[PDB]
């Protein structure tokens, strides 16, 4: 896979429909905890322990404490130069009649905070709820999401469960519902929204350039998307921190923090 920025820029200059697949590394460069992989814990758990239907079924208070903490942490986090290069790209190309779409597994909305409008959040958002009774999905930026969670979700080991009764967890505010809300986030063992997948497929079918940023093209989620693109002969450029180009079959690989490489690549 080629390391030539100048060669990439030649493709970039001509591209009318860029797909940008954004993985966990873009959020990690902003200091966002992911609670996955080595060392990444909340209390004694990782996401695989808490982001599951069974965990929510058995201990919804503990799961809401976890998501409350992650919501509140975002008050001290900012998009990085990679988010900004991506948003600025969308804005500049959009005035030229050229499309940029960001397909992200990140749930922290830093792409939105950076100014990205064309965003497919395949794992949902920390700042959306879904009613487990009526199914309504709502934006929710309230700090705290409900009064009982104020000061809860502390991440330190040894912190006891808040054990909030379900009636005092976040409830649906649709007239005549009152159901228990969950985060509008894909959990382990759960299906992706098929409508989002349909939209993803449309973008991949039409794009003439694909970036994979902050993740590898041979693991989920990029492995679900990049092969479709490469099969049509569309260049795929990878921007990640692996010194190993874990792939060939993809045209480009640029090693380093996305905040270092993308401002140059997308200028």
């Amino acid at each position: 896979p080629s390391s030539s920025m100048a060669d990439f820029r030649k493709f970039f200059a001509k591209a009318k429909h860029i797909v940008i697949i954004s993985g966990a590394g873009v959020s990690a460069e902003s200091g966002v905890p992911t609670f996955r992989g080595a060392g990444g814990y909340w209390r004694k758990w990782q996401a695989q322990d808490l982001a599951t239907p069974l965990a929510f079924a058995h201990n919804p208070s503990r799961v809401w404490e976890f998501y409350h903490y992650r919501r509140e942490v975002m008050g001290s986090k900012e998009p990085n130069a990679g988010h900004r290069a991506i948003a600025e790209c969308e804005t500049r190309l959009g005035k030229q009649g050229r499309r940029v779409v960001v397909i992200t597994q990140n749930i922290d909305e830093l792409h939105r905070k950076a100014g990205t409008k064309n965003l497919l959040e395949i794992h949902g958002s920390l700042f959306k709820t879904r009613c487990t009774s009526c199914g309504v999905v709502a934006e929710n930026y309230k700090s705290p999401i409900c009064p009982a969670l104020s000061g809860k979700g502390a991440p330190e080991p040894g912190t006891q469960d808040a054990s909030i009764p379900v009636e005092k967890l976040p409830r649906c505010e649709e007239a005549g519902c009152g159901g228990l809300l969950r985060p509008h986030v894909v959990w382990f063992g759960e299906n992706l929204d098929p409508a989002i997948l349909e939209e993803v497929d449309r973008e991949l079918a039409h794009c003439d350039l694909c970036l994979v940023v902050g993740t590898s093209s041979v693991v989920y989620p990029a492995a679900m998307f990049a092969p479709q693109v490469a099969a049509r002969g569309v260049p795929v450029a990878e921007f990640n921190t692996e010194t190993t180009p874990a792939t060939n079959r993809f045209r480009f690989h640029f090693q380093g923090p996305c905040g270092t490489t993308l401002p140059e690549a997308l200028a």
């Binding site: 695989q48 599951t52 965990a55 894909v186 382990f188 063992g189 989620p221």
Partner: peptide, 4 residues
């Protein structure tokens, strides 16, 4: 518990 691991599977997305």
């Amino acid at each position: 518990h691991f599977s997305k």
